[PDB]
Design a protein around this nucleic acid. Structure first.
Ligand SMILES: [Mg+2]
Ligand SMILES: [Mg+2]
Ligand code: NA
Ligand code: NA
Length: 310
DNA sequence: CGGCAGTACTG
DNA sequence: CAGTACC
DNA sequence: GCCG
C-alpha cells in the first residue's frame, strides 16, 4: 500500500459520511480507498489518479490536494457530531438513524445512553457488550466456537454439516464474529432444529444473549468456559442443501467480493444471492452443487476463500 | 438520470 | 412499514 | 462518491 498517506485521510471522510447516513458517498470513498490500497505505485498525477477504477474527478482532485499541501481542506470541516455518532452507532442494533436521534436529544456519551435513552432489547445487549463486540478474536477461538456448535448439532442429528464461514474461512488470523452455516444432504432434516440446538447451547451457559431468533437465522452472543474469556458474536444460519453452495459463497464473503460478484452477474443477465444463482430480466435458478459451479457459470476461474479477502 | 443487492428480522 | 443487520 |  504505497498510498496510505492518501487513504488515511480519505478513511476519515468515508466514516464521517457513513455515520451521517450518506451510504452511497461512503461506498464510493470505500471503493476508492480499496483501489488505492492495492495499486503498485504511489499515485502522483491527476491523470494518474483518474487512471484507477473507482477514482473519478472529485476524488482525483482530493488526492491532488493532499498531493501538494500534505492535508485535505475538507477534513477541517467535519461536524463535531461525527465522533459521537460513531460512538453510538458502534452499539449493535443502533445505526445512523438512532445515533442521529440520540444526538439531537442531547446525548453525548454512553453514560448518557445508559442513564437516559430508551433502548431496544437488542441495543441493551449491544451496550452491555460494547467493548467485547469491538474486539476481534484469535481464529483459534473461532475454531472452538464452531466445534462447540457442531458438537451440539451433531448430537441431535449425525448428518448435520456445520461450517464456519466469514473471515474464519478466508484464513484470517483475527475474526470479528463466527458465522456458522448448517445444512443436511438429505435436503429435509435441516428444518426445525433451532429449538433443540439453541436450548442445548443454552444448557452449557455457552449462549449468553439472543439478538435475533428467526426460522432460518440466529444471531446472538456466546462465551467459552474458563477465565480470561470474552463474549463473542455468533451467527448460525440453516439452509436447504440445494442452496449450500451459494450460501457458502455469500457468507464466506468478503462483502466487497460479493458486491463484485453481483456486479459481474448482472453484466451477464443473471443475479447472485445467498440462496441461488439465477437468470434475470424473475428468472430461473441455475444448479450450483459446489462453489466451483458458481464461478464456472459466471465464466470466472475458481478462487479459494483466502483469495476472496477483498 | 439513476443503480450501486436481496433478504431476514424486530416492533 | 423503517431501521438494522448479515456477507 | 463512481460510472454507464
Ligand atoms: Mg463474520
Ligand atoms: Mg457474522
Ligand atoms: Na477512473
Ligand atoms: Na450499530
Amino acid at each position: 500500500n504505497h498510498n496510505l498517506h492518501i487513504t488515511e485521510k480519505l478513511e476519515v471522510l468515508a466514516k464521517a459520511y457513513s455515520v451521517q447516513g450518506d451510504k452511497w458517498r461512503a461506498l464510493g470513498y470505500a471503493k476508492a480507498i480499496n483501489a488505492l490500497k492495492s495499486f503498485h505505485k504511489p499515485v502522483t498525477s491527476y491523470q494518474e489518479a483518474c487512471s484507477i477504477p473507482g477514482i473519478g474527478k472529485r476524488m482525483a482532485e482530493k488526492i491532488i490536494e493532499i498531493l501538494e499541501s500534505g492535508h485535505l481542506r475538507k477534513l477541517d470541516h467535519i461536524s463535531e457530531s461525527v465522533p459521537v455518532l460513531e460512538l453510538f452507532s458502534n452499539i449493535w442494533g443502533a445505526g445512523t438513524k438512532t445515533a442521529q436521534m440520540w444526538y439531537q436529544q442531547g446525548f453525548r456519551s454512553l453514560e448518557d445512553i445508559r442513564s437516559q435513552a430508551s433502548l431496544t432489547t437488542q441495543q441493551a445487549i449491544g451496550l452491555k457488550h460494547y467493548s467485547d463486540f469491538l474486539e476481534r478474536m484469535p481464529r483459534e477461538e473461532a475454531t472452538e466456537i464452531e466445534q462447540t456448535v457442531q458438537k451440539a448439532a451433531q448430537a441431535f442429528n449425525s448428518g448435520l454439516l456445520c461450517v464456519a464461514c466469514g473471515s474464519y474461512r478466508r484464513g484470517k488470523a483475527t475474526c470479528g464474529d463466527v458465522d456458522v452455516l448448517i445444512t443436511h444432504p438429505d435436503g429435509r432434516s435441516h428444518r426445525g432444529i433451532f429449538s433443540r440446538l439453541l436450548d442445548s447451547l443454552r444448557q452449557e451457559g455457552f449462549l449468553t444473549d439472543d439478538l435475533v431468533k428467526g426460522e432460518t437465522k440466529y444471531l446472538g452472543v456466546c462465551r467459552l468456559p474458563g477465565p480470561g474469556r470474552r463474549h463473542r458474536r455468533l451467527d448460525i444460519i440453516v439452509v436447504p442443501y440445494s442452496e449450500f453452495a451459494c450460501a457458502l459463497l455469500y457468507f464466506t464473503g468478503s462483502a466487497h467480493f460479493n458486491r463484485s460478484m453481483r456486479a459481474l452477474a448482472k453484466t451477464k443477465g443473471m443475479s447472485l444471492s445467498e440462496h441461488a444463482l439465477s437468470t434475470a430480466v424473475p428468472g430461473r435458478v441455475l444448479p450450483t452443487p459446489t462453489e466451483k459451479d458458481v464461478f464456472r457459470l459466471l465464466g470466472l476461474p475458481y478462487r479459494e476463500p483466502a483469495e476472496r479477502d477483498w
